[PDB]
Design a protein around this ligand. Structure first.
Ligand SMILES: *C(=O)CCCCCCCCCCCCC
Lengths: 34, 202
């Protein structure tokens, strides 16, 4: 079930994996808005 | 002219909440709205489904000029209707299929499929997905994001959230557009912001 996974995700970030985007080869404009 | 292959251009894209105060009064809030730097596509493969007909398979099939990556800074600051509206132009009169797949950790959780036909317009043809209902998962996802005390927590959740949109000629099965969507929450004065990138092989 995806609703139960969603709930676990959101409880997880409140009560503290792959390579995050910020460490990948992406342009600077990817991370800072115009 | 930004999100455009040689056979299809998406002029407009928006996702919105509309509320009806009374039968004559309506309030619309935009979460995101679109109305050229390159990115190596191999950088985002792990973030989308990669079985048969996944992002990789689609890119290698080509045409390589149909593939785009859009970064959204979504405005979550707001009788209810949750909708998605998009408009497209093509030189050709086609039957287009639009597939939108919502992904979590690179796995499809929900897919919506729409079939659209052409309308003649100034020597070319236009296509429109008007007021398509935003699915339950996305409504609930948005609600859960909104209740987070911290914005950086929202971004942490969105790190493993992606949306893949594939527009296809139903008869030839040619990919007309493939748009990969990555999201953050906007923290600015102007509200919702975006940046469009082209996906390349290297
Ligand atoms: C369900 O039917 C899938 C269709 C989802 C269409 C994508 C709409 C984009 C949502 C943008 C809102 C920003 C959320 C952080």
């Amino acid at each position: 079930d995806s609703e139960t996974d969603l709930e676990a995700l959101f409880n997880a970030v409140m009560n503290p994996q792959t390579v995050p985007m910020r460490l990948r080869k992406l342009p600077d404009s990817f991370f800072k808005p115009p | 002219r930004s999100v455009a292959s040689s056979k299809l251009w998406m002029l407009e894209f928006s996702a919105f909440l509309e509320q009806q105060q009374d039968p004559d009064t309506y309030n619309k809030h935009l979460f995101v709205h679109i109305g050229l730097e390159a990115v190596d596509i191999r950088q985002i493969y792990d973030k989308f489904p990669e079985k048969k007909g996944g992002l990789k398979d689609l890119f290698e099939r080509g045409p390589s000029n149909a593939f785009f990556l859009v970064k959204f800074w979504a405005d979550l600051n707001t009788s209810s209707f949750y909708g998605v509206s998009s408009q497209y132009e093509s030189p050709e009169n086609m039957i287009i299929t639009c597939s939108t797949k919502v992904c979590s950790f690179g796995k499809q959780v929900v897919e919506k499929v729409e079939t659209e036909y052409a309308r003649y317009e100034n020597g070319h043809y236009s296509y429109r997905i008007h007021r398509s209902p935003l699915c339950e998962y996305m409504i609930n996802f948005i609600h859960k994001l909104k209740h987070l005390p911290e914005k950086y927590m929202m971004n942490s959740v969105l790190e493993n959230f992606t949306i893949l949109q594939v527009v296809t000629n139903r008869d030839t099965q040619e990919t007309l557009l493939c748009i990969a969507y990555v999201f953050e929450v906007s923290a600015s004065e102007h509200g919702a912001q975006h940046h469009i990138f082209r996906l390349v092989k290297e």
